[PDB]
Design a protein around this ligand. Structure first.
Ligand SMILES: [Zn+2]
Ligand SMILES: [Zn+2]
Length: 44
DNA sequence: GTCCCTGTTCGGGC
């Protein structure tokens, strides 16, 4: 399973989510890199 | 192919 980054809901991922998405790193906020890329404070 | 999975509009991959 998974949880959508663009909205939260399971079943799909952000790419599949037909919703308004963010510019930068979904988790931390910064843009200069992506959520996958980021290893700032990915505790939970 | 049921379950897994991520950077665009939009479900493809095994
Ligand atoms: Zn979503
Ligand atoms: Zn980040």
């Amino acid at each position: 399973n998974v949880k959508c980054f663009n909205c939260g809901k399971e079943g799909h991922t952000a790419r599949n989510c037909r919703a308004p998405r963010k510019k930068g790193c979904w988790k931390c906020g910064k843009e200069g890199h992506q959520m996958k890329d980021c290893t700032e404070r990915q505790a939970n």
